[PDB]
JSON list of C-alpha atoms in Angstrom, two decimals:
[
{"chain": "A", "resi": 1, "resn": "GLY", "atom": "CA", "xyz": [0.00, 0.00, 0.00]},
{"chain": "A", "resi": 2, "resn": "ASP", "atom": "CA", "xyz": [2.96, 2.30, 0.61]},
{"chain": "A", "resi": 3, "resn": "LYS", "atom": "CA", "xyz": [4.21, 1.81, -2.96]},
{"chain": "A", "resi": 4, "resn": "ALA", "atom": "CA", "xyz": [1.52, 4.05, -4.46]},
{"chain": "A", "resi": 5, "resn": "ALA", "atom": "CA", "xyz": [2.42, 6.74, -1.93]},
{"chain": "A", "resi": 6, "resn": "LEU", "atom": "CA", "xyz": [6.15, 6.14, -2.40]},
{"chain": "A", "resi": 7, "resn": "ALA", "atom": "CA", "xyz": [6.21, 6.93, -6.13]},
{"chain": "A", "resi": 8, "resn": "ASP", "atom": "CA", "xyz": [3.72, 9.46, -7.47]},
{"chain": "A", "resi": 9, "resn": "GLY", "atom": "CA", "xyz": [5.64, 9.74, -10.70]},
{"chain": "A", "resi": 10, "resn": "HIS", "atom": "CA", "xyz": [6.76, 6.59, -12.57]},
{"chain": "A", "resi": 11, "resn": "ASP", "atom": "CA", "xyz": [3.34, 5.19, -12.03]},
{"chain": "A", "resi": 12, "resn": "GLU", "atom": "CA", "xyz": [0.76, 6.31, -14.63]},
{"chain": "A", "resi": 13, "resn": "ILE", "atom": "CA", "xyz": [3.36, 7.99, -16.84]},
{"chain": "A", "resi": 14, "resn": "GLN", "atom": "CA", "xyz": [2.60, 7.10, -20.47]},
{"chain": "A", "resi": 15, "resn": "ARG", "atom": "CA", "xyz": [4.93, 4.32, -21.58]},
{"chain": "A", "resi": 16, "resn": "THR", "atom": "CA", "xyz": [6.87, 4.46, -24.83]},
{"chain": "A", "resi": 17, "resn": "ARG", "atom": "CA", "xyz": [9.17, 2.46, -27.10]},
{"chain": "A", "resi": 18, "resn": "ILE", "atom": "CA", "xyz": [12.88, 3.13, -26.54]},
{"chain": "A", "resi": 19, "resn": "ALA", "atom": "CA", "xyz": [15.52, 1.97, -29.01]},
{"chain": "A", "resi": 20, "resn": "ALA", "atom": "CA", "xyz": [18.71, 0.80, -27.27]},
{"chain": "A", "resi": 21, "resn": "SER", "atom": "CA", "xyz": [20.95, -2.26, -27.20]},
{"chain": "A", "resi": 22, "resn": "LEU", "atom": "CA", "xyz": [20.65, -4.88, -24.47]},
{"chain": "A", "resi": 23, "resn": "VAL", "atom": "CA", "xyz": [22.69, -7.78, -23.13]},
{"chain": "A", "resi": 24, "resn": "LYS", "atom": "CA", "xyz": [21.97, -10.82, -20.95]},
{"chain": "A", "resi": 25, "resn": "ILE", "atom": "CA", "xyz": [24.31, -11.54, -18.02]},
{"chain": "A", "resi": 26, "resn": "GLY", "atom": "CA", "xyz": [23.24, -14.41, -15.78]},
{"chain": "A", "resi": 27, "resn": "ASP", "atom": "CA", "xyz": [19.77, -13.65, -14.44]},
{"chain": "A", "resi": 28, "resn": "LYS", "atom": "CA", "xyz": [20.00, -9.93, -15.24]},
{"chain": "A", "resi": 29, "resn": "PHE", "atom": "CA", "xyz": [19.36, -7.77, -18.31]},
{"chain": "A", "resi": 30, "resn": "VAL", "atom": "CA", "xyz": [21.83, -4.91, -18.77]},
{"chain": "A", "resi": 31, "resn": "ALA", "atom": "CA", "xyz": [21.81, -2.13, -21.34]},
{"chain": "A", "resi": 32, "resn": "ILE", "atom": "CA", "xyz": [25.01, -1.17, -23.15]},
{"chain": "A", "resi": 33, "resn": "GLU", "atom": "CA", "xyz": [25.66, 2.40, -24.30]},
{"chain": "A", "resi": 34, "resn": "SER", "atom": "CA", "xyz": [28.91, 4.03, -25.39]},
{"chain": "A", "resi": 35, "resn": "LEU", "atom": "CA", "xyz": [28.98, 7.83, -25.26]},
{"chain": "A", "resi": 36, "resn": "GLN", "atom": "CA", "xyz": [31.69, 8.85, -27.65]},
{"chain": "A", "resi": 37, "resn": "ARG", "atom": "CA", "xyz": [29.27, 10.20, -30.27]},
{"chain": "A", "resi": 38, "resn": "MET", "atom": "CA", "xyz": [28.17, 13.01, -27.97]},
{"chain": "A", "resi": 39, "resn": "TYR", "atom": "CA", "xyz": [31.78, 13.85, -27.04]},
{"chain": "A", "resi": 40, "resn": "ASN", "atom": "CA", "xyz": [33.57, 13.41, -30.38]},
{"chain": "A", "resi": 41, "resn": "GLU", "atom": "CA", "xyz": [31.03, 15.51, -32.28]},
{"chain": "A", "resi": 42, "resn": "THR", "atom": "CA", "xyz": [31.66, 18.40, -29.88]},
{"chain": "A", "resi": 43, "resn": "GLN", "atom": "CA", "xyz": [35.39, 17.62, -29.56]},
{"chain": "A", "resi": 44, "resn": "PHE", "atom": "CA", "xyz": [35.76, 17.55, -25.79]},
{"chain": "A", "resi": 45, "resn": "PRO", "atom": "CA", "xyz": [37.68, 14.69, -24.15]},
{"chain": "A", "resi": 46, "resn": "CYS", "atom": "CA", "xyz": [35.51, 11.76, -23.06]},
{"chain": "A", "resi": 47, "resn": "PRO", "atom": "CA", "xyz": [35.32, 11.01, -19.32]},
{"chain": "A", "resi": 48, "resn": "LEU", "atom": "CA", "xyz": [35.43, 7.23, -19.79]},
{"chain": "A", "resi": 49, "resn": "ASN", "atom": "CA", "xyz": [38.92, 7.46, -21.27]},
{"chain": "A", "resi": 50, "resn": "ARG", "atom": "CA", "xyz": [40.87, 7.70, -18.01]},
{"chain": "B", "resi": 1, "resn": "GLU", "atom": "CA", "xyz": [44.35, -17.46, -106.97]},
{"chain": "B", "resi": 2, "resn": "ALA", "atom": "CA", "xyz": [42.40, -15.67, -104.24]},
{"chain": "B", "resi": 3, "resn": "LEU", "atom": "CA", "xyz": [43.89, -16.31, -100.80]},
{"chain": "B", "resi": 4, "resn": "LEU", "atom": "CA", "xyz": [41.99, -16.15, -97.51]},
{"chain": "B", "resi": 5, "resn": "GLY", "atom": "CA", "xyz": [43.39, -15.85, -94.00]},
{"chain": "B", "resi": 6, "resn": "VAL", "atom": "CA", "xyz": [42.38, -16.56, -90.42]},
{"chain": "B", "resi": 7, "resn": "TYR", "atom": "CA", "xyz": [42.01, -13.68, -87.96]},
{"chain": "B", "resi": 8, "resn": "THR", "atom": "CA", "xyz": [41.31, -13.96, -84.23]},
{"chain": "B", "resi": 9, "resn": "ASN", "atom": "CA", "xyz": [39.15, -11.36, -82.52]},
{"chain": "B", "resi": 10, "resn": "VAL", "atom": "CA", "xyz": [40.12, -8.90, -79.81]},
{"chain": "B", "resi": 11, "resn": "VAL", "atom": "CA", "xyz": [39.22, -10.40, -76.44]},
{"chain": "B", "resi": 12, "resn": "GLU", "atom": "CA", "xyz": [36.61, -8.06, -74.97]},
{"chain": "B", "resi": 13, "resn": "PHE", "atom": "CA", "xyz": [36.38, -7.19, -71.29]},
{"chain": "B", "resi": 14, "resn": "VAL", "atom": "CA", "xyz": [33.58, -6.54, -68.80]},
{"chain": "B", "resi": 15, "resn": "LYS", "atom": "CA", "xyz": [32.35, -2.95, -68.96]},
{"chain": "B", "resi": 16, "resn": "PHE", "atom": "CA", "xyz": [32.67, -0.57, -66.04]},
{"chain": "B", "resi": 17, "resn": "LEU", "atom": "CA", "xyz": [29.13, -0.80, -64.68]},
{"chain": "B", "resi": 18, "resn": "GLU", "atom": "CA", "xyz": [29.28, -4.60, -64.60]},
{"chain": "B", "resi": 19, "resn": "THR", "atom": "CA", "xyz": [32.44, -4.69, -62.51]},
{"chain": "B", "resi": 20, "resn": "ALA", "atom": "CA", "xyz": [32.01, -4.64, -58.75]},
{"chain": "B", "resi": 21, "resn": "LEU", "atom": "CA", "xyz": [34.48, -1.74, -58.45]},
{"chain": "B", "resi": 22, "resn": "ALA", "atom": "CA", "xyz": [31.58, 0.65, -59.18]},
{"chain": "B", "resi": 23, "resn": "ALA", "atom": "CA", "xyz": [30.23, 0.01, -55.68]},
{"chain": "B", "resi": 24, "resn": "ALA", "atom": "CA", "xyz": [33.05, 2.35, -54.59]},
{"chain": "B", "resi": 25, "resn": "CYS", "atom": "CA", "xyz": [32.27, 5.19, -57.01]},
{"chain": "B", "resi": 26, "resn": "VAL", "atom": "CA", "xyz": [29.18, 7.10, -58.10]},
{"chain": "B", "resi": 27, "resn": "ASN", "atom": "CA", "xyz": [28.79, 7.19, -61.86]},
{"chain": "B", "resi": 28, "resn": "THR", "atom": "CA", "xyz": [27.33, 10.09, -63.85]},
{"chain": "B", "resi": 29, "resn": "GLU", "atom": "CA", "xyz": [27.70, 10.74, -67.58]},
{"chain": "B", "resi": 30, "resn": "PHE", "atom": "CA", "xyz": [28.56, 14.39, -68.12]},
{"chain": "B", "resi": 31, "resn": "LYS", "atom": "CA", "xyz": [28.21, 14.75, -71.89]},
{"chain": "B", "resi": 32, "resn": "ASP", "atom": "CA", "xyz": [30.41, 17.82, -72.45]},
{"chain": "B", "resi": 33, "resn": "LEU", "atom": "CA", "xyz": [33.27, 17.70, -69.95]},
{"chain": "B", "resi": 34, "resn": "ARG", "atom": "CA", "xyz": [35.85, 19.15, -72.34]},
{"chain": "B", "resi": 35, "resn": "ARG", "atom": "CA", "xyz": [34.09, 22.49, -71.81]},
{"chain": "B", "resi": 36, "resn": "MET", "atom": "CA", "xyz": [34.48, 22.38, -68.02]},
{"chain": "B", "resi": 37, "resn": "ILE", "atom": "CA", "xyz": [37.28, 24.41, -66.41]},
{"chain": "B", "resi": 38, "resn": "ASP", "atom": "CA", "xyz": [36.76, 23.51, -62.73]},
{"chain": "B", "resi": 39, "resn": "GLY", "atom": "CA", "xyz": [34.23, 21.92, -60.42]},
{"chain": "B", "resi": 40, "resn": "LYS", "atom": "CA", "xyz": [33.85, 22.40, -56.72]},
{"chain": "B", "resi": 41, "resn": "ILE", "atom": "CA", "xyz": [31.93, 21.08, -53.73]},
{"chain": "B", "resi": 42, "resn": "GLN", "atom": "CA", "xyz": [31.37, 23.36, -50.76]},
{"chain": "B", "resi": 43, "resn": "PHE", "atom": "CA", "xyz": [30.73, 21.85, -47.34]},
{"chain": "B", "resi": 44, "resn": "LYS", "atom": "CA", "xyz": [29.38, 23.87, -44.42]},
{"chain": "B", "resi": 45, "resn": "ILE", "atom": "CA", "xyz": [29.96, 21.98, -41.19]},
{"chain": "B", "resi": 46, "resn": "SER", "atom": "CA", "xyz": [28.14, 23.40, -38.17]},
{"chain": "B", "resi": 47, "resn": "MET", "atom": "CA", "xyz": [29.44, 22.20, -34.85]},
{"chain": "B", "resi": 48, "resn": "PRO", "atom": "CA", "xyz": [27.59, 21.69, -31.54]},
{"chain": "B", "resi": 49, "resn": "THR", "atom": "CA", "xyz": [29.11, 22.10, -28.10]}
]
């Protein structure tokens, strides 16, 4: 009963169809995204390259 | 006495559109290219930040 009071948003938000890549690791589904396209089109150094 | 001979033909080759090299180039037929002096392409690259 607390769950409806715990999250006002993220219940009854209109769902959609998101295009992204996925991967299956054990019992868990993980998404994979590489953000170099948003850093190499603006020509700042990427924070994942350490 | 009329003499005849044997000639062998020139071995023809596959034309340019039927080779698979034309997947690397874009082919147009510009009819009068000996009138052209120059040709240019002008890019305009806007950059986000």
